[PDB]
Design a binder for this molecule. Structure first.
Ligand SMILES: C=C(C)[C@@H]1NC(=O)[C@@H](NC)[C@@H](O)c2cc(Cl)c(O)c(c2)O[C@](C)(CC)[C@@H](C(=O)N2CC=C[C@H]2C(=O)N/C(C(=O)N/C(=C/C(=O)O)C(=O)O)=C(\C)CC)NC1=O
Ligand SMILES: Nc1nc2c(ncn2[C@@H]2O[C@H](COP(=O)(O)OP(=O)(O)OP(=O)(O)O)[C@@H](O)[C@H]2O)c(=O)[nH]1
Ligand SMILES: Nc1ncnc2c1ncn2[C@@H]1O[C@H](COP(=O)(O)OP(=O)(O)CP(=O)(O)O)[C@@H](O)[C@H]1O
Ligand SMILES: Nc1nc2c(ncn2[C@@H]2O[C@H](COP(=O)(O)OP(=O)(O)O)[C@@H](O)[C@H]2O)c(=O)[nH]1
Ligand SMILES: [Ca+2]
Ligand SMILES: [Ca+2]
Ligand SMILES: [Ca+2]
Ligand SMILES: [Cl-]
Ligand SMILES: [Mg+2]
Ligand SMILES: [Mg+2]
Ligand SMILES: [Mg+2]
Lengths: 338, 437, 54, 428
């Protein structure tokens, strides 16, 4: 019988994971501070990595990768991309971004003018709910007083009917062998309101957060349930309207971006030869512009699933990340091969 | 030449001292009778080995060593063992009643009644030193004598030898071989009292040594003899530059200069490679590149921790055997592109390198295979603070319930010494985190 | 990477390689605390012997 | 810390004490003559712990024999090793104590105690570094109970810095029908709570149940009961009598086993359980020893370990076996039953291996636990005590020796407090 402990009570994903483990009848849950565990589902902040892998007679697995935060917090993802040769400054799938403290301030000024200099669009977004898009360089640095400033995708792919913005969320599982698993089901987080080129402080339709749309936007739930379109429907839309597929038009770029992100940090966070072992579930967020090119907007280290898929994703976590290491008595992921 | 006095406190320090001096003589061609046929200055001299040995007119080479335990079982088998003739009865100091794994008992109770005898026997050694540079102090964290008496002696050495430097080789407690539940308490107590008095401390976690023995020497259940002959190899490699001609780490002062920029952060991580079973039938001799790269595998560290998630302040590579600088610099160039080695911004990214051409010596009939070339890395990384967190966590769990505290108070210690010690440790943990993240 | 400070002798050699440049209480006070614990012990013992005498 | 002074008091204390000296003497190669005829030199390395050497290379137990009645000590004198005890260490009267704590502690025992302490002193003074004392006694009679705990308070006053260790036999109505034993035992526990460092609770209730249910003995004799006792006493003193690392003297054992001064009552356990002159032809595997020694059916105190939590545990494995397999078996009981080990004392289970097995067995193990479930044992004595005490029944046997009711009320209060202090720590 295996043992585990639960130190993030707020996590929808691993709350499910715990229930599934106990229902196996071969997993026992101890109290949070009992160290004689096989598996720790850890807290989101200041997780005690330094205390794992020091208990004789116990193989120990944890559901976070120490050091994955440098992929998962806004400003550090930008520095990671700019300063890593494998990603390079010359990176075709990350919106040109800048780290601004309340540093690359005058770094950013030169890029702003070169575009106003050159008859170009100059919309930008400032990120860290404290969410500000503009064309004024004045107004962003007005508001800053750490934050990131990045290109606004002025020409997004808009769904019809609706003239609707959206983003894509990909759930990716990385096991203790650093296999990179992409869950076959993604989800589309759509805007309920038509997209506007003049209404920038009208953020109803410029930010596709599922929180903003449920009851800060008037047309919520209209075109699809929860503003959540799955991959079956979105592919048929691409076929019917655009004469292409999800795999060809978008998923390949998403697979390339995911593999390129996790391969880059792999030397820094791999637990291959370590005294404890890590896995982790990430949520990758992509924009798709109107020429069917994919962009990475950010990486979430503690994601929640979409309701429909909880049962299936959390079963795959167990099968792939947990019973990999602790065996018991057609796969739902696609493995991104390196 | 400047003499170095070695002090071995408690069972752990005495038995590790035993394995070290045995290795030393093998490395220097000193026989168990203390004769050194190759020393052609009979009756004295000031060669580099004289840093650790004195000489008698009969030509006997004598460790500059004092052994002290508060009970006699352990040192007695020195007095009657293979190197019985090496040591002077004045050098081996015993109590009758030990510290019962109680820091307070070794520090306050039994420590007050033997501290002056020990300093005197130490003073007889210094008097024989033309230019004493300081002390190497061997002890467990976990025993009562190793923790409580050691901290007493270190306070007094700082008084009676205020300018001499003081180095530690410290055995960090591991449940797989430990003998007491209060070892966390003792460890925090003695670290707190000894911190200001220690210029440079090398911590060996019995857990790491235990596993290196299991996985790389195929020893199912390692004993103190297995553990100590490995420790003595690592200790030998760290002290070699004081006992052999060379230009890096030539006196104890240089260890602080090279390895410890901030005096509280004075705990370099040691990594050693390679460790090969002597009973291993087929072995492919490892290259300069391969043993240098193993210096960044946590599985070869004396403390299991992850230097990728900290920052470096200093790095020394100590090679023994068939090694030339060209191989080292290529190895380092390659490793630097494949590994996560980040220094703190105020230090240069770089390595101090010492090569000694003689390969490591092995004990006849030991567990270690003789190899072509070997290396010890001494790196001051903030990752070692992981071991403070582990220990401090265990202290907190017990102290919150005051478990066992009455054993220390009963010896005259005040409960407030606990929380002082623990607050010193909490400050240490924060210094490491500011430097390192 | 610049090699610097190279020294050689018959027994080995020594150098430094740089990949990238920088980017105590008295004897009295100790005797004081040893004896302050000693009489904390002797008080505690005395209290036990007083109790045992009752 | 070398020498132990052994004191045995009363009928139970002398019968179980004699069997102890029998058992370890054969373990160390000493025969009734007092002479050594063994092979291993492991036998003699720490022989000084329990034996004084004489000039003829004869070994004399550092043992003192006390009773207010000659009978049993006469029986010890003419039993197997009776001639190994030095004759001047037989200290006895003629009164008897009539199963009366007050007589043993306050009147009859008073008359005799000083002459016992003269023997203690002579044996103490001739030690290089005396580490303390061990006493065997029942808590249910009068001498071992009342005079035993009087002796302990005297020894503590003249050796306040030595370790006091007892093997204390707990009364059970299953094997005694003497009605006043809950009084004697409660009065003794009061004393033990204050003046000993470590007490092994040897519960006649457990001894009887083991004999009847496990060894299938329908009429358990005292020899059957003491056969379990002597195995336990051999096992729990193993670390003191042979070379080793863990709990090798009384004080280190105390530091490892007692996190709070009053909570020093240990629950011994043993495996394999054997009956006298049994066959026992199948050696136990290391997994068998480890499951058996932690089983409630193997404990020598009638308490359910699952009903409490272990504060500290010492395990001693005897015989030739794989230390690796011993380690992994020990790690597995902790990791599989981790709830039952208090989280706030990390790594509270310490394991020792000795190569020399006990007589008759190739493989054996002894368990020593500081469990909060020991409270069940003191609850039982307390319920039997208050049933009589609330009607003040049988008190005249005590008040007629000079005792007052309030000394009873003080005793039962202290034991009830002990019970409550165990329940405290059972709830982290
Ligand atoms: C009916 C009697 C006499 C008495 N029964 C009771 O008191 C019962 N009354 C409710 C009850 O208390 C009881 C029941 C049972 Cl099944 C017992 O075994 C029992 C008590 O145990 C004792 C007291 C001995 C543990 C048990 C006892 O004393 N026995 C059982 C068999 C012999 C004697 C005995 O043990 N005598 C010995 C002795 O050693 N006997 C031995 C006998 C043998 O060789 O087999 C031996 O091992 O040396 C001594 C007094 C110590 C020297 N007492 C009883 O059986
Ligand atoms: N590596 C190694 N560790 C040891 C050795 N001896 C003891 N230890 C460890 O040190 C701790 C116990 O300290 P000891 O040195 O035995 O205690 P001590 O200094 O003799 O103090 P007391 O005996 O309590 O008076 C435990 O962690 C042991 O595992 C040894 O020979 N080698
Ligand atoms: N560069 C860009 N161009 C156009 N739209 C963008 C953009 N960056 C973000 N957005 C829009 O803003 C939304 C939210 O921005 P952001 O990247 O901060 O997500 P968020 O982390 O703040 C909420 P969550 O982390 O739960 O997804 C995106 O989903 C997208 O709708
Ligand atoms: N296990 C065991 N219990 C005994 C023995 N002798 C007496 N007892 C128990 O001890 C209690 C009576 O105490 P006893 O020692 O006979 O009285 P004392 O001589 O006045 O100290 C009762 O509970 C008996 O069951 C013995 O040899 N073995
Ligand atoms: Ca010479
Ligand atoms: Ca100093
Ligand atoms: Ca009289
Ligand atoms: Cl000086
Ligand atoms: Mg010791
Ligand atoms: Mg007198
Ligand atoms: Mg009787």
């Amino acid at each position: 019988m295996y043992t585990f402990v639960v130190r993030d009570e707020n996590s929808s994903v691993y709350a499910e994971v715990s229930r599934l483990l106990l229902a196996t009848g071969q997993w026992k849950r101890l109290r949070k501070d009992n160290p004689r565990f096989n598996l720790m589902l850890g807290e989101r902040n200041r997780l005690p990595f330094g205390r794992l892998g020091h208990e004789p007679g116990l193989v120990q697995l944890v559901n976070y990768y120490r050091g994955a935060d440098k992929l998962c917090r806004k400003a550090s993802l930008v520095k990671l991309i700019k300063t890593s040769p494998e990603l390079s400054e010359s990176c075709t799938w990350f919106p040109e971004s800048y780290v601004i403290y309340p540093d690359e301030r005058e770094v950013f000024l030169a890029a702003y003018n070169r575009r106003r200099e050159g008859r170009e669009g100059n919309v930008w977004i400032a990120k860290s709910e404290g969410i500000l898009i503009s064309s004024e360089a004045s107004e962003l640095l007005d508001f800053i007083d750490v934050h990131v400033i990045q290109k606004y995708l002025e020409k997004p792919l808009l769904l019809e009917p609706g003239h609707r913005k959206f983003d894509i969320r990909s759930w990716v599982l990385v096991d203790h062998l650093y296999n990179i698993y992409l869950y076959r089901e993604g989800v589309l987080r759509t805007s309920s309101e038509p997209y506007n080129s003049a209404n920038f402080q009208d953020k109803t339709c410029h930010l596709t957060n599922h929180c903003i749309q449920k009851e800060y936007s008037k047309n919520y739930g209209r075109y699809e349930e929860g503003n959540e379109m799955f991959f079956e429907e979105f592919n048929q839309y691409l076929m019917d309207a655009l004469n292409t597929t999800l795999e060809n038009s978008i998923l390949l770029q998403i697979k390339h971006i995911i593999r390129s992100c996790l391969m880059c940090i792999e030397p820094a966070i791999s637990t291959k030869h370590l005294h404890y072992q890590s896995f982790q579930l990430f949520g990758f967020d992509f924009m798709v512009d109107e020429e069917l090119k994919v962009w990475l907007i950010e990486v979430n280290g503690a994601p929640a699933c979409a309701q429909k898929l909880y049962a299936e994703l959390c079963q795959g976590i167990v099968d792939v990340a947990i019973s990999s290491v602790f065996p018991l008595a057609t796969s739902i992921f696609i493995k991104l091969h390196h | 030449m400047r003499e170095c006095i070695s002090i071995h406190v408690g069972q752990a320090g005495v038995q590790i001292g035993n394995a070290c001096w045995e290795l030393y003589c093998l490395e220097h061609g000193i026989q168990p009778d203390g004769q050194m046929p190759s020393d052609k200055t009979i009756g004295g001299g000031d060669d580099s080995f004289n840093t650790f040995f004195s000489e008698t007119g009969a030509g006997k080479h004598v460790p500059r060593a004092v052994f002290v335990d508060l009970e006699p079982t352990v040192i007695d088998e020195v007095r009657t063992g293979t190197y019985r003739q090496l040591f002077h009865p004045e050098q081996l100091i015993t109590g009758k009643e030990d510290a019962a794994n109680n820091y307070a008992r070794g520090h306050y109770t039994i420590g007050k009644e033997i501290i002056d005898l020990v300093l005197d026997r130490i003073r007889k050694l210094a008097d024989q030193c033309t230019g004493l540079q300081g002390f190497l102090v061997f002890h467990s964290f976990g025993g009562g004598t190793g923790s409580g008496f050691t901290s007493l002696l270190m306070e007094r050495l700082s008084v009676d030898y205020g300018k001499k430097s003081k180095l530690e080789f410290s055995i960090y407690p591991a449940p797989q071989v430990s003998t007491a539940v209060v070892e966390p308490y003792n460890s925090i107590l003695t670290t707190h009292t000894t911190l200001e008095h220690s210029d440079c401390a090398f911590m060996v976690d019995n857990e790491a040594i235990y596993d290196i023995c299991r996985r790389n020497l195929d020893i199912e259940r390692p004993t103190y003899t297995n553990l100590n002959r490995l420790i003595s190899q690592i200790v030998s490699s760290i002290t070699a530059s004081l006992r052999f001609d060379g230009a890096l780490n030539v006196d104890l002062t240089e260890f602080q200069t090279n390895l410890v920029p901030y005096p509280r952060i004075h705990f370099p991580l040691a990594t050693y490679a390679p460790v090969i079973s002597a009973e291993k039938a087929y072995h492919e001799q490892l290259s300069v590149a391969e043993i240098t790269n193993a210096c960044f595998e946590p599985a070869n560290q004396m403390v299991k921790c992850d230097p990728r998630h900290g920052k470096y302040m200093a790095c020394c590579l100590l090679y023994r055997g068939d090694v030339v600088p060209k191989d080292v610099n290529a190895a380092i160039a390659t490793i630097k592109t494949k590994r996560s080695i980040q220094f703190v911004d105020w230090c240069p990214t770089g390595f101090k390198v010492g090569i000694n051409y003689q390969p490591p010596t092995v004990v006849p009939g030991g567990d270690l295979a003789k190899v072509q070339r070997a290396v010890c890395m001494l790196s001051n990384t903030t990752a070692i603070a992981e071991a403070w967190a582990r220990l401090d966590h265990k202290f907190d769990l017990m102290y919150a319930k005051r478990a066992f505290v009455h054993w220390y108070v009963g010896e005259g210690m005040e409960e407030g010494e606990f929380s002082e010690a623990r607050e010193d440790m909490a400050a240490l943990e924060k210094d490491y985190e500011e430097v390192g993240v | 990477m610049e090699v610097i400070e190279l020294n050689k002798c018959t027994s080995g050699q020594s150098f430094e390689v740089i990949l990238k440049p920088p980017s105590d209480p008295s004897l009295e006070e100790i005797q004081k605390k040893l004896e302050a614990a000693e009489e904390r012990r002797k008080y505690q013992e005395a209290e036990l012997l007083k109790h045992l005498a009752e | 810390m070398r020498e132990i002074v052994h004191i045995q008091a009363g009928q139970c204390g002398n019968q179980i004490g004699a069997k102890f000296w029998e058992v370890i003497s054969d373990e160390h190669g000493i025969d009734p003559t007092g002479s050594y005829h063994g092979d291993s030199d492991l036998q003699l390395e720490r022989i000084n712990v329990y034996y004084n050497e004489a000039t003829g290379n004869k070994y004399v137990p550092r043992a003192i024999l006390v009773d207010l009645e000659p009978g049993t000590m006469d029986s010890v004198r003419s039993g197997p090793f009776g001639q190994i005890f030095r004759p001047d260490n037989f200290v006895f009267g003629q009164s008897g104590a009539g199963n009366n704590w007050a007589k043993g502690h306050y009147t009859e025992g008073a008359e005799l105690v000083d002459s016992v302490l003269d023997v203690v002193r002579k044996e103490s003074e001739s030690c290089d570094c005396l580490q303390g004392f061990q006493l065997t006694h029942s808590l249910g009679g009068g001498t071992g109970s009342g005079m035993g705990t009087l002796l302990i308070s005297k020894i503590r006053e003249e050796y306040p810095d030595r370790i006091m260790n007892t093997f204390s036999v707990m009364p059970s109505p299953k094997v005694s029908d003497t009605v006043v034993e809950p009084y004697n035992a409660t009065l003794s526990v009061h004393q033990l709570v204050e003046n000993t460092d470590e007490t092994y609770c040897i519960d006649n209730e457990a001894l009887y149940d083991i004999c009847f249910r496990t060894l299938k003995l329908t009429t358990p004799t005292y020899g059957d009961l003491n056969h379990l006792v002597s195995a336990t006493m051999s096992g729990v003193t193993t670390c003191l009598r042979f070379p080793g690392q863990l709990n090798a003297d009384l004080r280190k054992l105390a530091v490892n086993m007692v996190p709070f001064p009053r909570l020093h009552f240990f629950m011994p356990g043993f495996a394999p359980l054997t009956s006298r002159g049994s066959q026992q032809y199948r050696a136990l595997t290391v997994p068998e020893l480890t499951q058996q020694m932690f089983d409630s059916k193997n404990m020598m105190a009638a308490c359910d370990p699952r009903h409490g939590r272990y504060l500290t545990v010492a395990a001693i494995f005897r015989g030739r076996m794989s230390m690796k397999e011993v380690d992994e078996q020990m790690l597995n009981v902790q990791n599989k039953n981790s709830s039952y080990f208090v989280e706030w004392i990390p790594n509270n289970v310490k394991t020792a291996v000795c190569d020399i097995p006990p007589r008759g067995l190739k493989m054996s193990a002894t368990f020593i636990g500081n469990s909060t479930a020991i409270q069940e044992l003191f609850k039982r004595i307390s319920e039997q005590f208050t049933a009589m005490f609330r009607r003040k029944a049988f008190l005249h046997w005590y008040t007629g020796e000079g005792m007052d009711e309030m000394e009873f009320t003080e005793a039962e209060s202290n034991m009830n407090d002990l019970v409550s202090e165990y329940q405290q720590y059972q709830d982290a």
